[PDB]
Paper text:
In yeast, the class I histone deacetylase containing [name] complex plays a critical role in the suppression of spurious transcription by removing histone acetylation from actively transcribed genes. The [name] [name] complex has five subunits ([name], [name], [name], [name], and Ume1) but its subunit stoichiometry and how the complex engages nucleosomes to achieve substrate specificity remains elusive. [name] deacetylates histones H3 and H4 to prevent cryptic transcription initiation events from within gene bodies because an accumulation of histone acetylation can lead to the destabilization of transcribed nucleosomes, ultimately resulting in the loss of nucleosomes from the gene body. [name] is directed to actively transcribed genes by binding of the [name] subunit [name] to nucleosomes via an association of the [name] chromodomain (CHD) with methylated H3K366,12.
Here we provide the cryogenic electron microscopy (cryo-EM) structure of the complete [name] complex bound to a nucleosome at an overall resolution of 2.8 Å. Our model suggests that the [name] complex is comprised of single copies of [name], [name], and Ume1, alongside two copies of [name] and [name]. The core module positions the [name] histone deacetylase subunit centrally and positions it above the N-terminal tail of H4. Instead [name] HID residues Glu811 and Glu812 insert into the [name] basic patch and form an electrostatic network with [name] residues Lys41, Arg280, and Arg316. Consequently, the presence of [name] makes the requirement of inositol phosphate obsolete in the [name] complex. Additionally, [name] positions itself on the nucleosomal substrate by interacting with nucleosomal DNA at super helical locations (SHLs) 1, 1.5, 2, 6.5 and extranucleosomal DNA at SHL 7.5 and 8. To identify the interface, we used AlphaFold2 multimer predictions of the N-terminal [name] with H2A–H2B and identified a [name] region encompassing residues 30-65 as a likely candidate for H2A–H2B acidic patch binding. Interaction with both DNA gyres positions the [name] chromodomains proximal of the H3 tail, allowing the trimethylated H3K36C analogue to insert into the [name] chromodomain aromatic cage that is formed by [name] residues His18, Tyr23, Tyr81, Trp84, and Trp88. The binding of nucleosomal DNA and the trimethylated histone tail is identical for both [name] chromodomains. Our cryo-EM analysis revealed density for a seven amino acid long peptide in the active site of [name].
Residue numbers in the entry:
A (entry chain a), B (entry chain e): 35 to 135
C (entry chain b): 22 to 102
D (entry chain f): 25 to 102
E (entry chain g): 14 to 118
F (entry chain c): 16 to 118
G (entry chain H): -1 to 3
H (entry chain h): 29 to 121
I (entry chain d): 28 to 122
The structure:
Amino acid sequence: VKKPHRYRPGTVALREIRRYQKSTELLIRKLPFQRLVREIAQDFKTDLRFQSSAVMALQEASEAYLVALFEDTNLCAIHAKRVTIMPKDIQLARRIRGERA
Amino acid sequence: VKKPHRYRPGTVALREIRRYQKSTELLIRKLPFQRLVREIAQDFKTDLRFQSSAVMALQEASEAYLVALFEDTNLCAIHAKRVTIMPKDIQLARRIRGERA
Amino acid sequence: LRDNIQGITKPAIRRLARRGGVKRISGLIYEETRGVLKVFLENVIRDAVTYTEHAKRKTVTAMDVVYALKRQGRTLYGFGG
Amino acid sequence: NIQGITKPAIRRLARRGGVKRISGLIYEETRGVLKVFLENVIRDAVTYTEHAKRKTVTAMDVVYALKRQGRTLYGFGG
Amino acid sequence: AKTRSSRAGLQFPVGRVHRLLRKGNYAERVGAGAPVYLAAVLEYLTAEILELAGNAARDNKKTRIIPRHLQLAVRNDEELNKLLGRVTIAQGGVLPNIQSVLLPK
Amino acid sequence: TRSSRAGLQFPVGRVHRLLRKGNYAERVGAGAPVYLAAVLEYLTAEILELAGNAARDNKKTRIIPRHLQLAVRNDEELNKLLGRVTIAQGGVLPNIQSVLLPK
Amino acid sequence: XXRXX
Amino acid sequence: TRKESYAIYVYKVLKQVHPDTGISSKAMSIMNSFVNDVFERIAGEASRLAHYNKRSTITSREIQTAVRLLLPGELAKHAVSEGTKAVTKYTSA
Amino acid sequence: KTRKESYAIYVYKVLKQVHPDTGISSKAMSIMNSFVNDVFERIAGEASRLAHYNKRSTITSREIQTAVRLLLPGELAKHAVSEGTKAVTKYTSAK
């Protein structure tokens, strides 16, 4: 007899888009990314140490690359008359960029 | 009564794709491209001379670039569930490549 | 260290997509993004560790990462260099 | 002169690129793209020839210009 | 005036630029005017970026330029964004833009 | 010579001269030219092995640019190395997308 | 695949 | 020890452009990295130009051509004008 | 008549090593020479950058090895490193 205030799907998504394009703080949590970086590095040399600045630089580079990739992915998804990005969109973006063979 | 052997549309297109992916000769006529190169250059410097090898190198680079662009354009068109390449396909390919802003 | 790629949670990828201007995200996108991120990190950390080994150091410095990114064509400002 | 890049020539380039069906407007767009690419490459080549104080654009100037843009070309004394 | 920058009327170090050109393995010899020219170009580009960064900082009612303002300055300028097309600015963020089709009707 | 002293076909002397005159560093070590010449010879040997294979597949005894392009692009690692390189008179690999083929 | 020498 | 940087010079340029505007440490580092990057680009292109022409010296002409190649249109024009004016002032003094 | 240098003879020797009964065309030889020059420049430039980063004034075989490991992909880098080390050891053996 009242109904809660549910925003129509796609509204909070746009609000989040605005919020996260307005800000600059890193979006990936720091500890999980550091653990991932160390695990990946473990396959090239054992008993490696990382300067905190090194992990931060890796995180910034990775986040910037992923954001640019998602921009290209959204462009491809819109090109297909879609609104949802799908793995095929990421694959096409990477293929055109020249990253994926 | 009589009837021509018209190939179903899209068959000679495949034959031409096979023929032109199997060869290596340049697909743009030499003289028109040379005239185009000279006209573009005359904007930057007047009374310019071109080594024949210089124009040939320009043609090779241009044709290779256009062929790669058309490959990406074809991929973009197929991504859109189409078979025809259309200018929006070229625009998306260039935008993802980073060529066009 | 095991199964840390899943540390890049679904909401983190959602935030990254939102910063990229994405409104609707397919469910399969998260695993694909994790794979792409793993490939990128592997390509970068390989060169970073190569630089570290050449310097005969056991510590990967931020300047090694910066050199690796610059080598790959992703120059990064704000960490020296 | 840019129209010297004929419709059949762009068709051949598209075919070598694996394109089966080509829209009508693709030809003008391709002419524009080729014009932009040639403008960049020839501008760099002419810069190189001017710096060398030459009135002739040599294949080496073109090769260096392409190498600048990340389009290294082999087969012309690179 | 003693400093070479003062002779060239620059704020950037002509002497330091000359030393780097020499200890950079760029060529056997380095002309006398090359450091001056390079210092002038670097000064011009730095001023060009800082003008737009300061404008962006003012738009945010901020006295100090932070990496976000540098990112806005670079990306909102066509030529500068083309110069730094393949550059990541830490803490830069992205230019706010949303594709038209994603907006409500 | 120094190539014979290292068992190489490529010129260690010429490579040393090019390293010194190329303005790469103040001094060039003694083993640097040998190492670099060995790497260059190895890469040319790999490219030529694949190109001669392609020429044989084409029933030709002389390698032309087309064979070099085929060898480079078919091989994953060489193609990755020469990713941003265009080989004059190389053409492209025959490749047609599946959806474009007739049903 | 893997190379010979 | 001494870690050299462009902090002071960039600060002088800033105060000459926006006298009432400061710069944060992170922005300072980014600007210093940018100056180093552009220095490397221009110097490398000038080195390549000298090598191509069988020339052993990097003159102001090489730097000018490297700037014309590296920078886009309007930026290249203005940078060339600034460089030539600075070189002329230096030669006069 | 100017004396222009090239890698033609060494490329031909390597070819006769790998494919004894196979020639090469002038255009293909030019492409191979360009490829050798390009790889030389890439490796030498990366080695120079490595030496500069480490505040070292000499390009040693170690710098070349690390440059090769950076530039070439996995298996190609492995085999190139193997050949380089083999050549260096064989060289230092003889005098």
